[PDB]
Symmetry: C3
Subunit: 454 residues, 3 copies
Amino acid sequence: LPGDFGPPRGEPIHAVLTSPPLVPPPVNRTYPAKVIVELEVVEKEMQISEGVSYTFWTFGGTVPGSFIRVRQGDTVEFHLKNHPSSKMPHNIDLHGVTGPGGGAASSFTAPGHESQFTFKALNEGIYVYHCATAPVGMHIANGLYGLILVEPPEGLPKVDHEYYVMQGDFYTAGKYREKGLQPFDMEKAIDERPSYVLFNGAEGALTGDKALHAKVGETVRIFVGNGGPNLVSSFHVIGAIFDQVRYEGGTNVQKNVQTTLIPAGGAAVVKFTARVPGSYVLVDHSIFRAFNKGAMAILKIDGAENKLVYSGKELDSVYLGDRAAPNMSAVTKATQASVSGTLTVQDQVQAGRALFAGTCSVCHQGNGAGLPGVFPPLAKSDFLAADPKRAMNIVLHGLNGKIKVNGQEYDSVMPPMTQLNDDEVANILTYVLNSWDNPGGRVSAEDVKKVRAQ
Amino acid sequence: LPGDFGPPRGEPIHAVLTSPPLVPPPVNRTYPAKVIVELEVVEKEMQISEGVSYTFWTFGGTVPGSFIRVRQGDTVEFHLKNHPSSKMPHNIDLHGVTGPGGGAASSFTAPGHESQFTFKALNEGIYVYHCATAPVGMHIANGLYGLILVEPPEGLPKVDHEYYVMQGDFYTAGKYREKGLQPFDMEKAIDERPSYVLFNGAEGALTGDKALHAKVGETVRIFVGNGGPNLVSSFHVIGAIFDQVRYEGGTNVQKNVQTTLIPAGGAAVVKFTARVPGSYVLVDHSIFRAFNKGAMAILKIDGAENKLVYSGKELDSVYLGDRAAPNMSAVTKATQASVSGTLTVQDQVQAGRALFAGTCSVCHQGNGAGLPGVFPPLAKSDFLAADPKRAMNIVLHGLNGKIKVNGQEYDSVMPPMTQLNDDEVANILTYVLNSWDNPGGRVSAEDVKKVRAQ
Amino acid sequence: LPGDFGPPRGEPIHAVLTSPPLVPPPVNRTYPAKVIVELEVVEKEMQISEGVSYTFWTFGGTVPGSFIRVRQGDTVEFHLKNHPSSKMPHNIDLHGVTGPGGGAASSFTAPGHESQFTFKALNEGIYVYHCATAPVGMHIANGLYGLILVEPPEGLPKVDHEYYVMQGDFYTAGKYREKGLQPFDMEKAIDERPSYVLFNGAEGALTGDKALHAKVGETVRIFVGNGGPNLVSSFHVIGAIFDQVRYEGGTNVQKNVQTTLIPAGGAAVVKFTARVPGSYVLVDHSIFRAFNKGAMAILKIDGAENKLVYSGKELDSVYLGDRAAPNMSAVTKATQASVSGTLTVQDQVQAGRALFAGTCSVCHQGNGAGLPGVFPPLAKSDFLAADPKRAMNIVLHGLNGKIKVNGQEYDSVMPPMTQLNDDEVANILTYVLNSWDNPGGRVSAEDVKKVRAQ
Ligand code: HEC
Ligand code: HEC
Ligand code: HEC
Ligand SMILES: [Cu+2]
Ligand SMILES: [Cu+2]
Ligand SMILES: [Cu+2]
Ligand SMILES: [Cu+2]
Ligand SMILES: [Cu+2]
Ligand SMILES: [Cu+2]
């Protein structure tokens, strides 16, 4: 058999697991060991987006689940606990396991119970693990997946940073960015029509102040999973190249590629060398996923510019939209205040400020000045002030034809933005009304609901 | 030109074709030959699922079509017959053919006719063949695809077993497991929204008593096709690894991978070495295909357990659901009895028994005992007996909140199972009512139809 | 850094860009240069299909955009102009650029403006470029993508022909082949449900009289892009094989494959050697794309037949359908005449003639004779003449059961063809009525609209 390095030696090792986006240290070991792995399933509400709650099913309290790191030839004694608060039974199938179900039958664990099974890690490589409990698709869709690394006996080459990034497709009853606790939607899941496509279980999980970091000249290894359940990632780094891409434990290594297809349930190790400073975007290049459903993550490189290599500027809201900023905490706060019935004008203003970035600023500018004769101003806009209800219709349904704004004619097209939710339109317009010498007041979600219906 | 091994020598060879999942023997030949291939298109009803009929269009009476095996450098005289019972014209495009349409124009065959054309097999490799008749997508969707192997001149390395597995996506007017003769649905096909995703033309075609077999220590080669028409397979073996994956006649060979993307119209040769006994599941790891639409096949390995490699148990209904069992013949029988108007309580009981596995047993257990205080019993259930109509509502629409069953409180969540068809709910509940000291009687599909509508 | 060939030498080079499907000449240069690239965004209506207009956003007036060809180690001074007629701002992200956004922030260009940035081409390979302006998916969906080749320092091996082919998915409010100016459909785009899947921005862009050409014995290199935004191409050549497939600047080269997966945003260089004459079809082998949404392109090879390799005939309308013919200009003319209110019987006849190929002729024959007792005649058809309204119902809704046509019984199935638009049914039936001694007259789109509604 492969991984024939003899019986376990030394002492039993209690595996130290890490939460995304971090990785356990290299095993740094020349002998096979008995490794004891303890992983606990926890079902809990978390924010899938600002003001959007979801009942996740998690391995270790995170999506993706805790990272497991062992050595080819190790004997793994795998313990799965199911927290007493769980409503569902759970189990595990680890890719890389030699045996039926990858552990599934022997890891069946009711709420408040523990199971264990033992396997030899015969196969080096990076591998997806996931729940294997009927209905399997529901369990995986709710977040039950992670990565296990089985190192080659000599270890992977040294790098400056190792990170853990895992794509998933998610299925909410509500539409993208519709607030509240969103149930799982079985019909969307069966049709492979996700409402969100995410890295690490949430919109913005790896953007802004949650970005990954490295410095010019450093090497970065990323362990990239695709939990699915259903989508295949056109996995891509914007503005860079992968030195290496290696799938699972494959003998093949692709070098010097920017775009690479990761199967549903697949995993790859990618290597990046930082050359010039700025934000490098990991995306699913099935572009509506990346830019309309949340499938973007950032590796931010600090260090000296090299104008001979790249003369240009850091990413901004034109490309990254409302994820250019450190966070959108104001949207969470405004949503909470709406639930509590304490929503203030300033709550709306700060939420709208966050949402205006990219969505509106690409044309109207961050200062609302637009571009005379090309993009009309929102700053001190007579046309806006004259009819706040018209402004709701313009955001939802677009605007075209000749108009006059602050004494100048425009004859252009503002596309409809019907995908914005009632609260988003209300908060954006309240921000605009309370900025740039506009007349103040507020737009409510209910105001926008009425315009959308007629 | 490649395959330049000279003119055909020896005697003309009448190719012996095989039905899935079997493969013709190695050609075992050191000279190029004239190989005569005879393939007949037959249009006929077959069961795509238990009690679900479909009008398949087949090469050789099977989906996928008969397997063709020749040697690089052979001259192939290809004869296509279209059975007189056919309503449609048919033809063939074989991948690996050097020439326009891969044979399409010269193989146009009306019902009751025969065509022939000759090609040299210049290209070694495994290749999809399919019908190439307008509307091409309709012909392929109805099952008109198979594999042709063009061996390298020295032959493939010897293995213990060779099998033939081909994925397809299928488009029925009715939903998944809706009984009766299901028309092709053009609108679902254009939108790439299949109702079934299958190996070898049916649900359960390669599960249970139809599984592929090998023994511990043996090598298994699988010729894997993806007929499409539309889907790309995240092709995966649960609980194992592929020693090798080779696409078409590619120079590249990937080794030691578990998950591999097979394009629509693509084919690969995979190699497996049996290490420990049990069921190894071939899936499309776009998971809702595998677990909600039929895309699972089994390679069952017999032999001695090795607890040092894997301590765990064989697959069961928790993972495989209602395909853990040898077959679901009872569902076919009950459906037939419904059509004939002779449906008995015991017909329903046996159909429900088959469908209860995984679907209900994952939580309620195979004996209906559940888990006190966690999963309420269906065995001798006062709550079930008290209101059979409520039980229909619970299966369709779920149940949550505090309830009392057999003297114990539950406060958990049973998800809705609205995807079950009226007959499936009726048969499952009739099985439960006639098991475990429950009060007997029956639930009808019409009973369930009324609850679903209100 | 890679591409470390020193500072630019010689004179600054003004890059000569080419329109699809042509490629600039090899750079044929042994020193690194400063290359000045000028690319202008133009928003304009073009025909996405005959009689179907679309507002494309283009780099250089074409979809895909102008081809850029430079040498690894070059310093590229990139100038982006946005034509004054533009309504939207635009920018660029070139894959292969080392720097944040691949140029996006520094190339933001309002209508009537110009931007520039400088990058070193460190990375050899074929790369997608695309617009990177919020909403990014909308910009890409409207056609803003192309290819940049960064040659290795020694150049690519010499071939007889180099061509430029780029797949895209498109999202119209109307259905496939519904006439008129079709708006972008955001809801279809978010759901990844394209109405058209095309090579080079239109149906028939590379078919018939727009086919690519080469001769027997010649080598053809194709630079293949996938602009997306959303789809992954099961990229395939019908009746041939790729000698080589190389993705982006990857070290890996696959040889001797026919079917290859191109990620969304991906690019590959493929090599073909012409062996026998005829039409070789480039398709997305997700077959409904290729045969129902426009995803087919032709490389037509002229030269001597070799009956030892392939005895068969050139492609015809059975496989290629209504794209077997040089063009479908008659459909454009008839659509124009309908708009102008000058639609004649002969306008309809010529449009119907073009649309009858494959769609109807596969069964009824190009001469309408059918096959006695198998496919009933449309030529001098008593059954057709007897009830023109029935003929509309038959095309839309199909026909089955026993009928009598010209004295002979038929007992077969004509599938429904509801996907044909009202004008297409009207024009096809007007062609049939005015051919083969049929009674003449005409069917109007309004006639067909009424039958479809009842
Ligand atoms: C460029 C693609 C735009 C984006 C994104 C947004 N707007 Fe816009 N807007 C745009 C144009 C070209 C026009 C004029 C259309 C015409 O008929 O010529 C407008 C118009 C408005 C108006 C009314 C005029 C004014 O007060 O300046 C409002 C109130 C407005 N737009 C608001 C707005 C908001 C809030 C946006 C984000 C949700 C937004 N616009 C995006 C161009 C573009
Ligand atoms: C776990 C995910 C479950 C699956 C799968 C099925 N059931 Fe269930 N069921 C489950 C729970 C946790 C509960 C109690 C909910 C609560 O409010 O606490 C139930 C309840 C029932 C009942 C009513 C109570 C009883 O008689 O025990 C019935 C009749 C019932 N469930 C039937 C049933 C059938 C037939 C299933 C397969 C179609 C099925 N359940 C699946 C948990 C789960
Ligand atoms: C084969 C798959 C067919 C294609 C494609 C089309 N037609 Fe057809 N048609 C076909 C059959 C087998 C039948 C007879 C059905 C039966 O009940 O036996 C028909 C019938 C007609 C008729 C009526 C009979 C006649 O006049 O011959 C008409 C007017 C007709 N078909 C027209 C038609 C047109 C215009 C098509 C392209 C849009 C078309 N058919 C396609 C088989 C097939
Ligand atoms: Cu689970
Ligand atoms: Cu898996
Ligand atoms: Cu056919
Ligand atoms: Cu094909
Ligand atoms: Cu743009
Ligand atoms: Cu890109």
